[PDB]
Design brief:
Order of helices and strands: EHEEHEHHEEHEEEHEEHEEHEHHH
CATH topology: Rossmann fold
Strand order of the largest sheet: 3-2-1-4-5-7
Helix content: 40-55%
Keywords: Nucleotide-binding
Bound molecules: nicotinamide-adenine-dinucleotide
Protein name: NAD dependent epimerase/dehydratase family
Number of helices: 11
Number of strands: 14
Strand content: 15-25%
Family: Belongs to the NAD(P)-dependent epimerase/dehydratase family.
Radius of gyration: 19 Å
Organism: uncultured archaeon MedDCM-OCT-S05-C57
GO molecular function: L-threonine 3-dehydrogenase activity; nucleotide binding
Distance between the termini: 46 Å
CATH class: Alpha Beta
Oligomer: monomer
CATH architecture: 3-Layer(aba) Sandwich
Number of domains: 1
Structural class: alpha/beta
Length: 311
Amino acid sequence: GSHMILVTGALGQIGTELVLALQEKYGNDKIIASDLKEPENYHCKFEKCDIRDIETYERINNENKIEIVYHLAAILSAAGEKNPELCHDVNYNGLENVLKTAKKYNQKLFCPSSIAVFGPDVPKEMTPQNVELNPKTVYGITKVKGEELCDTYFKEHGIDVRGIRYPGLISWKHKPSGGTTDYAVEMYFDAVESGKYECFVNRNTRLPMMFMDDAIRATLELMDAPLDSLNYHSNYNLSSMSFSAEELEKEISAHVDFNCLYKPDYRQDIADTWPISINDDDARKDWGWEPKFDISKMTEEMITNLRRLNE
Ligand SMILES: NC(=O)c1ccc[n+]([C@@H]2O[C@H](COP(=O)([O-])OP(=O)(O)OC[C@H]3O[C@@H](n4cnc5c(N)ncnc54)[C@H](O)[C@@H]3O)[C@@H](O)[C@H]2O)c1
């Protein structure tokens, strides 16, 4: 086959790093990036597209002989509370476009979910894989519907679509976009840049978090697993860390001097409805998941690179 891979949402937090990992794994000639606007200074072949534009999306897939899509395009939780209609449109109708195309062209898919599928009616601690999904955000609802649609494509249409309920992801290669979990990223950036941070959640806010290298590795490992080994498809729980905002402040302060003030905003109301930690036994059992970055190791990577960038 062509062995060609498309990454939608390629310019975002995950995509910035996933494109590189896929180029190194498969060879640079095998990877096509797509997002809304063509970037200036960019070492991957790029095809612009709105994920809602089925005609152009199909054309990109056809012409490039795409066999595998890593579908990252989305509107996230905080933006989705501000703009519910946009969130539904982009997330649900974009996903539907991706799945319909996969069925036409016999594609394999990665379509991620989020811990935002969970609401406060199920356990906050070590949330199980199989509990009711009654999210309290628009975004969470889109993700629940998306899990279900993916699993319908798998069962009814034979599409090998896989996905992870990512926790909050922390990275330094992309500027923070002010998402709900972005207080962890921003705290690092602002600590190193200015020695001060105004945190938009309260000091005890405690969410499942993961360093990007772990999330990217998890994504690739899940995609490489034999299909018959998977007991879940669109929606693996996935865990690494669970810490509060002040715990992160104390970790960062062991390395860098900084003033952290807590001034919650609307994003608190999102975070408060999510679990603190996640039971990912099924990922660990079915496909060998184990995280490699604890808070100390992640902190060293973040601070070292951010200090370099601030030279
Ligand atoms: N980063 C996290 O902490 C996290 C956590 C859970 C789930 N996820 C999921 O992972 C995926 C990627 O997340 P991310 O953090 O990289 O998001 P992001 O916002 O950084 O990237 C999403 C990309 O989608 C693009 N996009 C938006 N609307 C579009 C449209 N109409 N057509 C085409 N492209 C469009 C944006 O331009 C952006 O580059 C999403 O499915 C998200 O729900 C992320």
